[PDB]
Design a protein around this ligand. Structure first.
Ligand SMILES: O=C(N[C@H]1COC(=O)[C@@H](NC(=O)c2cc([C@@H]3O[C@H](CO)[C@@H](O)[C@H](O)[C@@H]3O)cc(O)c2O)COC(=O)[C@@H](NC(=O)c2cc([C@@H]3O[C@H](CO)[C@H](O)[C@H](O)[C@H]3O)cc(O)c2O)COC1=O)c1cccc(O)c1O
Ligand SMILES: [Ca+2]
Ligand SMILES: [Ca+2]
Ligand SMILES: [Cl-]
Ligand SMILES: [Cl-]
Ligand SMILES: [Fe+3]
Length: 426
């Protein structure tokens, strides 16, 4: 029995009720899809009492390229001859970086949070189903309210250097009917409807409506120009899909960024809009039925990084995470407000100072979890709630967690994941 370093998939659970952190045994990532490559999970989607994730191919590890004298190497000219690269895309000699099979998408369906015996299904109609920004892999699989799972691809691989690693498929969407175990016949080419544009990430709003953060020009590694929103009605136009750019937002050349995860309530989506350069961020309400946006709460801070609701007994409030960035520091404030649609909030008092967070997740209206990314080192997390006096309070337990590149919720577990180096037997 021979042990060696191989690629695995790490899973971290934050149980919200028991307030306990667990690591799963690392899942073997090598040859996850049957072609030798290893994978990164993108998204943890709860629907139909199951977990859906997109196993995003990463190419071949050093172990994978060497395995049985290059068995898995389709394009040997791409195997790296020396260490190189930058940031989370640094590579080592012997790697084959990024997938050799860009013209397909996989989805893994798991019966529960123990992540055993996945149903793995493939489509050749779209490229892999994630968005990309730096190290992070953005969820682009989402469930309509009836349980149908829509699988979106922005065709990020079209920007790969080598022809054989670029996808030739336009950004598009496919479907897994609720309770089905394979894709059905649905397909929507989004570039045909969008004016040739793809997207950075997307989310579910309500019903069969989804929100897409659209590019003004070509998709790119830095996310430049991801400054418009569109509403996608999946079953629109006789089950062919319909895409409408959102009206009422600032001009794209006036938007610096959007806040990251929308807050959905009563059939609409609230999103923070951070303008370039006196102009303060504000929360806009996006009505998917009319694809219209209206300006609401103003946030007197640098940016907005989370929007949600917290409650305890008879108390409840909206909560807006606001960043305050100075020349020498970056601070974060949780701000309580009774409305997202008028007025303003300012740190300096109902605010509560926290560390900054790479990702913020509301668990229902009960808890707010902060997840911090730390490059190659370990991530960090803390959690917040409303006390019995309706004030914002920090939860007792904090955690050091494995490096993560995606996250989601299933049941009472917040789940985070990444592709790791790990020892495996054989
Ligand atoms: O605040 C943050 N970073 C901070 C701190 O980081 C830094 O000072 C530097 N970084 C790292 O050293 C780094 C190191 C690792 C790991 O290091 C280990 C040692 O322990 C090695 O042994 C391992 O092998 C592993 O590699 C992973 C990372 O992620 C890293 O960043 C320099 O970076 C920058 O100056 C900017 N960064 C960027 O421009 C940037 C750009 C990309 C690009 O993405 C494109 C698609 O979008 C294309 O695909 C390109 O191919 C790819 O290059 C990817 C990134 O990861 C980026 O950071 C701004 O960032 C920051 O200054 C932060 C926030 C959110 C998410 C993140 O990932 C962050 O880093
Ligand atoms: Ca749902
Ligand atoms: Ca401070
Ligand atoms: Cl629906
Ligand atoms: Cl409101
Ligand atoms: Fe990085």
């Amino acid at each position: 029995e021979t042990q060696s370093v191989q690629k695995g998939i790490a899973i971290t659970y934050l149980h919200v009720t028991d307030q306990i952190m667990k690591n799963r045994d690392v899942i073997r990532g090598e040859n996850f899809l049957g072609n030798g490559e290893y994978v990164t999970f993108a998204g943890i989607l709860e629907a139909n009492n199951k977990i859906y994730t997109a196993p995003i191919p990463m190419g071949l590890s050093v172990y994978g390229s060497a395995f049985e004298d290059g068995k898995w190497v389709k394009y040997p000219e791409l195997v790296k001859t020396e260490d190189g690269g930058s940031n989370s895309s640094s590579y080592e000699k012997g790697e084959l970086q990024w997938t050799q099979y860009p013209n397909e998408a996989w989805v893994a369906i798991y019966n529960d949070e123990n992540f055993n015996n996945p149903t793995l299904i493939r489509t050749d109609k779209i490229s892999y189903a994630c968005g990309r920004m730096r190290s992070q892999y953005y969820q682009t699989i989402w469930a309509a309210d009836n349980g149908d799972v829509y699988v979106f691809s922005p065709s990020y691989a079209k920007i790969m250097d080598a022809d054989v690693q670029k996808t030739n498929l336009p950004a598009g969407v496919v479907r897994i009917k609720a309770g089905a175990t394979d894709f059905d016949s649905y397909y929507c080419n989004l570039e045909e409807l969008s004016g040739g544009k793809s997207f950075l990430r997307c989310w579910h709003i309500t019903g069969d409506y989804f929100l897409l953060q659209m590019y003004t020009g070509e998709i790119n590694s830095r996310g430049t120009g991801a400054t418009r929103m569109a509403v996608f009605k999946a079953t629109g136009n006789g089950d062919k899909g319909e895409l409408y750019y959102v009206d009422g937002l600032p001009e794209p050349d006036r938007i610096s960024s959007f806040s990251g995860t929308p807050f959905c309530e009563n059939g609409v989506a609230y999103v923070g809009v951070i303008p370039i350069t006196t102009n303060h961020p504000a929360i806009y309400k996006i009505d998917p039925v009319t694809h219209t946006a209206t300006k609401g709460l103003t946030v007197n801070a640098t940016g907005i990084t989370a929007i949600g609701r917290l409650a305890k007994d008879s108390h409840s409030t909206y909560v807006v995470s606001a960043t305050v960035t100075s020349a020498n520091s970056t601070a974060n404030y949780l701000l309580a407000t009774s409305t997202l649609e008028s007025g303003s909030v300012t740190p300096g008092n109902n605010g509560f100072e926290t560390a900054t967070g790479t990702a913020w997740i509301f668990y229902k209206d009960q808890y707010l979890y902060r997840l911090q990314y730390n490059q190659g080192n370990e991530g960090v997390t803390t959690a917040y709630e409303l006390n019995t006096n309706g004030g914002i309070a920090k939860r007792s337990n904090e955690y050091t967690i494995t490096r993560f590149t995606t996250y989601g919720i299933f049941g009472e577990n917040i789940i985070s994941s990444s592709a790791v180096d790990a020892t495996f037997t054989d």
